[PDB]
Amino acid sequence: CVAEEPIKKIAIFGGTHGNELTGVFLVTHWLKNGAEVHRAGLEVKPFITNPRAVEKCTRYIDCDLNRVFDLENLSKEMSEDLPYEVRRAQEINHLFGPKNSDDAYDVVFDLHNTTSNMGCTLILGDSGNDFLIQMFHYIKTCMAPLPCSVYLIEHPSLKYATTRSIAKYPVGIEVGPQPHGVLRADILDQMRRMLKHALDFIQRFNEGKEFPPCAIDVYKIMEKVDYPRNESGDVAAVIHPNLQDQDWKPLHPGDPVFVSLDGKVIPLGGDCTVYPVFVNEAAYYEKKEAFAKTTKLTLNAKSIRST
Amino acid sequence: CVAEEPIKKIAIFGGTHGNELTGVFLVTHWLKNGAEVHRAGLEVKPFITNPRAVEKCTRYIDCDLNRVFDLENLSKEMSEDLPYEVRRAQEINHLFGPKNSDDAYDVVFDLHNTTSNMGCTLILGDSGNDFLIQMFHYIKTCMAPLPCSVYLIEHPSLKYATTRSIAKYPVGIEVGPQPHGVLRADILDQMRRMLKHALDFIQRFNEGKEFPPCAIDVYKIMEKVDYPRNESGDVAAVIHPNLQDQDWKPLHPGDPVFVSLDGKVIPLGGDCTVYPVFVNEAAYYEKKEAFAKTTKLTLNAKSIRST
Ligand SMILES: [Zn+2]
Ligand SMILES: [Zn+2]
């Protein structure tokens, strides 16, 4: 049984990307009216992380706020040509960190949307963290029969620079499909239910509930796949209609992945089954990612209890 | 029978809004590879109307290119204060107009995408235009039983400043739903099919096909409906899930239209059945349009032929 410290300070971040409206709308509402996110014994602080991008309804001002929380950026002196989001990341770190300190917030839920058909998605940064595996098992049980899928990042590069990484326990909450700059009522309902259960879990944990051992399936990112490109670097083929909206569904080497305007089909390739995620995300065209290949695995957590 | 001269000069505009990728991708392709839009006897010119917005994948740089083709803007003196899209509209007017001259292009197809669930949509500016009614009837007939809906936008305050308004016969071609900044294969195949039949119609008309009288159903704009807003001017309620994606379907006075986070449902109101269009289009939040109410009517066209 993993013995563990009670959680005291929780933040809920929305508008990390300024055009992802669900987190913006909920955090804006909870700042006005906090009853929904109140839990006995918890300090819960909703916060808009990129208000300048939110006011422009744009992903970012100068660079992605979700890529500048690495140590180098958090400790960088200001310079004239430095992206705005580096200065904003320091401001957020000053309020909710410092990152890697005992004073840092215990849990940060960073709220995101995607244009990909990923449904309710939890992002896990540590495959050995019993506390988070337990929380995610709890949320999934409460959301059932809506799928609630878990994306695991092991590589340090794709997690160490994220906004949620300031917390002792980072949690990414990702819900799609939703076009950026749109608020869909269904997506809002799904995200608010995920949060309701995550907060319930934390309060129960604090109150001394002992959670028995559990296991969850997770999809661990293997590598990004770019679009085929023309000499000039523009996209030469698009996501095949059979792959479009089929995030999480197994893809085999001969299955079609891209299609060109002439009707040429390009299949997955390789030697293994993969589970594609972020299929056709708008923000990722410039990041050279048509989708990411993942592998499925099981994580077990030991029982846990507050000390 | 209305006899008209053969159509000679046709333009196909893509990227009027730079983040609506279907027309950008198709036009970019046809500039290099024109066979798909070749027709015997026709001069077909693909053209990217807002190259700066396209390169930044954004709707516009300074102002909406689809709002600046009014004579005041087009006749504005060249200066350094001038919005980029004003300077660009004047270039387009010189190349494909001038608007209101006998030298203007005969047909301009302006290609758009929407995040609303509208399917294939043709935009008609003039309810008396026998040639356009016949073209649209042809396209609908050829696509049957696939959805192909016609939106009639007639008042001068609504039509006078559009990019396509330079042509003798302006045609808007609109296909959704597609997140902006995303290219879906399905949406691409729908828009290519509309255009194939539109160009086939023009060729047959020029070749002497005589078209008997026809009729089409259209949805004529009545008025825009904004989101309920707080004192601050931020959105206070979102599109109700029963209205979400239900473009074109009759909506009655007591049917739900918005829902707040606190759960208040706001009904249509008024005294008549309407047909909503552009339900939840991302670009329209700032235009104060949650959706447009329309009324359905039948338009007849005389027999037409080429002289
Ligand atoms: Zn995001
Ligand atoms: Zn448009």
The structural domains of chain B, ordered by start, are 1-225+274-307 (3.40.630.10), 226-273 (2.20.25.160)
For residue B261, what are the contacts with CB-CB under 8 A and spacing of at least 6? A25, A26, A29, A188, B237
Nearest to A268, CA basis, from A285, A286, A243: A243
CB A145 within 8 A of CB A203: no
What CA–CA distance (Å, rounded) separates B181 from B59?
10
| A116 phi and psi angles, rounded to 5 deg | -80, 155
Nearest to B134, CA basis, from B202, B219, B37: B202
Query: Is residue A95 within a helix (H) or strand (E), and if so which, with residue range?
Result: helix A84-96
Query: Is residue A131 within a helix (H) or strand (E), and if so which, with residue range?
Result: helix A130-143
| Cβ–Cβ below 8 Å for B177 and A177 | no
| Cβ–Cβ below 8 Å for A180 and B181 | yes
What CA–CA distance (Å, rounded) separates B255 from A87?
48
Q: Is A227 exposed, middle or buried (0-12, 13-18, 19+ CB in 10 A)?
A: buried
| Cβ–Cβ below 8 Å for B282 and A115 | no
What CA–CA distance (Å, rounded) separates A109 from A96?
12
Sign of the CA dihedral with B185 first, then B186, B192, and B196 last: positive
CB A175 within 8 A of CB A141: no
What CA–CA distance (Å, rounded) separates B7 from B207?
10
Q: Please list the alpha-helical segments (H only) found in chain B.
A: 21-32, 51-56, 71-74, 84-96, 130-143, 156-159, 185-206
Instruction: State the amino acid at position A116 in one-letter form.
Output: S
* Beta strands B256-259 and B238-239, pairing class: antiparallel
Nearest to B68, CA basis, from B80, B51, B84: B84
- Side-chain-facing half-sphere of B68: CA atoms under 13 Å: 26
Breaks in chain B after residues (C–N exceeding 2.5 Å): none
Instruction: State the amino acid at position A210 in one-letter form.
Output: E
| Cβ–Cβ below 8 Å for B115 and A182 | yes
Residue A188 is nearest to which of B28, B238, B262, comparing CB atoms? B238
* Resolution of this entry, Å: 1.8
For residue A92, what are the contacts with CB-CB under 8 A and spacing of at least 6? A47, A49, A69, A163, A166
- The SS3 call for residue A239 is strand
| Cβ–Cβ below 8 Å for B238 and A25 | yes
Contacts with B244 from chain A: Cβ below 8 Å: 184-186
| Cβ–Cβ below 8 Å for A180 and B184 | no
Q: How far is the CA of B247 from the centre of ligand 1 (A)?
A: 28
What CA–CA distance (Å, rounded) separates B217 from B296?
7
Nearest to A247, CA basis, from A208, A202, A293: A293
Looking at A85, A174, A281, A289, which residue is catalytic? A174
* Beta strands A9-14 and A107-113, pairing class: parallel
- The SS3 call for residue B5 is coil
Q: Closest chain A residue to B185 measured between Cα atoms?
A: A241
For chain A positions 90-119, those within 8 Å of chain B (CB to CB) are 115
- Structure determined by: X-ray
For residue A67, what are the contacts with CB-CB under 8 A and spacing of at least 6? A161, A162
Instruction: Kindly provide the b/e burial profile for residues A200-217, where b requires at least 16 CB atoms within 10 angstroms of the residue's own CB.
Output: ebbeebbeeeebeebebe
- The SS3 call for residue A23 is helix
Do you know the residue count of chain B? 307
Residue B188 is nearest to which of A181, A185, A238, comparing CB atoms? A238
- Catalytic residue list contains A43: no
Residue B185 is nearest to which of A115, A234, A241, comparing CB atoms? A241
Q: Which DSSP category does B232 fall into?
A: T
Query: Is residue A84 within a helix (H) or strand (E), and if so which, with residue range?
Result: helix A84-96
Instruction: Say which ligand is closest to the CA of A66.
Output: 1
Preferred mutation among A27, A59, A235, A238 to probe B, highest tally of B CBs within 10 A: A238
| Cβ–Cβ below 8 Å for A285 and B181 | yes
* Structure tokens, B30: 């046809």
Query: Is residue A136 within a helix (H) or strand (E), and if so which, with residue range?
Result: helix A130-143
Give yes or no for B234 touching A (CB within 8 A): yes
Q: Which position has the token pair 């695995």?
A: A297
Instruction: State the amino acid at position A127 in one-letter form.
Output: S
Residues of B catalogued as catalytic: 174
Nearest to B234, CA basis, from B260, B266, B257: B260
Give yes or no for A242 touching B (CB within 8 A): no
What CA–CA distance (Å, rounded) separates B44 from A157?
49
- The SS3 call for residue A106 is coil
What CA–CA distance (Å, rounded) separates B236 from B263?
11
* Structure tokens, A282: 């708008």
A39 is in an annotated binding site: no
Contacts with A60 from chain B: Cβ below 8 Å: none
What CA–CA distance (Å, rounded) separates B44 from A271?
46
Q: Which DSSP category does A156 fall into?
A: S
Instruction: Kindly provide the b/e burial profile for residues B202-237, where b requires at least 16 CB atoms within 10 angstroms of the residue's own CB.
Output: beebbeeeebeebebebbbbeeebebeeeeeeebbb
How wide is the angle at C-alpha B142 spanned by C-alphas B137 and B148, nearest 5°? 65
A50 is in an annotated binding site: no
Residue A115 is nearest to which of B179, B185, B188, comparing CB atoms? B179
What CA–CA distance (Å, rounded) separates A247 from B112?
27
Beta-bridge mates of residue A47: A13
Contacts with B246 from chain A: Cβ below 8 Å: none
Q: Is B156 exposed, middle or buried (0-12, 13-18, 19+ CB in 10 A)?
A: exposed
Beta-bridge mates of residue A266: A258
Give yes or no for B241 touching A (CB within 8 A): yes
Q: How far is the CA of B14 from the centre of ligand 1 (A)?
A: 28
Give yes or no for A303 touching B (CB within 8 A): no
For residue B13, what are the contacts with CB-CB under 8 A and spacing of at least 6? B23, B27, B47, B48, B49, B108, B109, B110, B111, B163, B164
* Structure tokens, A40: 């006995």
Instruction: Say which ligand is closest to the CA of A115.
Output: 1
What CA–CA distance (Å, rounded) separates A214 from A101?
30
